[PDB]
């Protein structure tokens, strides 16, 4: 029950979502020897775009802060209850990646404005085990893509994705992967950088921020 062709309206919605995604700070996530590395261009000191989700599952996002932030909270919520019901090692990056996509699709179909967000869920292996890091990208519609090496979110993704395509090296150390990620992100200054890792070597909680003087020394 509406005038403007529904298909046309859907196309307009997609265009609006694309525009929202485009005008945003860029984030990258890439696999390196010790796990996964998140490097985001973030000027504020209070507002963050990278977060722990569960013991070995991390999360980065790009778009509208209140919404991506809201998903952050929803994701945190689901994991704790699930773990309490069954156990910590039962929550996986895959299940979480799935939940966001379904929620996003349903929400978009029944809501007014689509979430101008782009998500990346990351997972590493547990302590004393061998397994490759897994990166998933969830887009605004509900689509989910399995990435083997790196994810780039928000802003103009082409130049960063290509620079990473030339510079990426599996089993790069933490410093090399940081140089590659900052370099491809430039395609900056010590200030306004949000850097965190999913260090596979930690016993339980793998997420760990790299801020201040140590970061400066590394760079």
């Amino acid at each position: 029950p509406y005038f403007i062709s529904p298909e046309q309206a859907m196309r307009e919605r997609s265009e609006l979502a694309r525009k929202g995604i485009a005008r945003a700070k860029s984030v990258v996530a890439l696999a390196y020897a010790g796990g996964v590395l998140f490097v985001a261009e973030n000027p504020s000191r209070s507002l963050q775009k990278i977060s722990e989700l569960y013991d070995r599952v991390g999360f980065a996002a790009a778009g509208k802060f209140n919404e991506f932030d809201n998903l952050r909270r929803g994701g945190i919520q689901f994991a704790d209850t699930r773990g309490y019901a069954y156990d910590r090692r039962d929550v996986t990056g895959r299940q979480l990646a799935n939940v966001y996509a379904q929620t996003l699709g349903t929400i978009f179909t029944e809501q007014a404005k689509p979430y101008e967000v782009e998500l990346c869920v990351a997972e590493v292996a547990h302590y004393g085990e061998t397994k490759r890091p897994e990166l998933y990208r969830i887009t605004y519609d509900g689509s989910i893509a399995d990435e083997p090496h790196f994810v780039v979110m928000g802003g103009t993704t082409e130049p960063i994705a290509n620079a990473l395509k030339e510079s990426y090296a599996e089993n790069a150390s933490l410093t090399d992967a940081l140089r590659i990620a900052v370099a491809a992100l430039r395609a900056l200054g010590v200030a306004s950088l949000e850097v965190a890792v999913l260090d596979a070597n930690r016993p339980r909680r793998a997420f760990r921020r790299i801020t201040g003087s140590a970061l400066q020394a590394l760079l």
Partner: protein, 222 residues
Amino acid sequence: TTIVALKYPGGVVMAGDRRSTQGNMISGRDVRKVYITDDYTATGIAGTAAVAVEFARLYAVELEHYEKLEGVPLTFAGKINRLAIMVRGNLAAAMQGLLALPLLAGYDIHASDPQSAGRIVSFDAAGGWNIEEEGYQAVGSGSLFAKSSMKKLYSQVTDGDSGLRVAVEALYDAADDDSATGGPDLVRGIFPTAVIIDADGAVDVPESRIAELARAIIESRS
């Protein structure tokens, strides 16, 4: 009723008698009290017969349901937890008399040492559980006699078969000192039931083997 379970190097064995009573009256001569809930766990349940068979059935359903949804079985820890939550749920009815206590035997495929991956777990009416570490457990009206028998006989356990014989003997002594536990009926040919779990899963011991062990014990005591 009486259900014993004991670890042996490389596996676990779980055996149960066959009698079911109402007061002093013998009502069932061939009940099966030990189920194979999954490829690596068997569950015995002592207590009210209805609540028992229901527990076993529903728990098997739930294990397999999560397995179908997630594509991988729970860890032995998760299984322990779900069984515990069921048991805790029956507590109100257990105070009203419908008490059912489970004894859970499993073989952990993820354990480090295969020779000690066997697992025995015991529950109380309030859902608390305990991982047994002295090598054996039992439940039911004959449990005390069975445990006091296995404490002495347990140094003889060296493999799957010796462990099976020790199980059958423990049952024989339970029945020998308690009237609610049935012994091997030589007349009708009804013997305890047994399940063996090792690296290759869970299999029911075929009746003939239990028959021979029981006849050996009975002739030893004469």
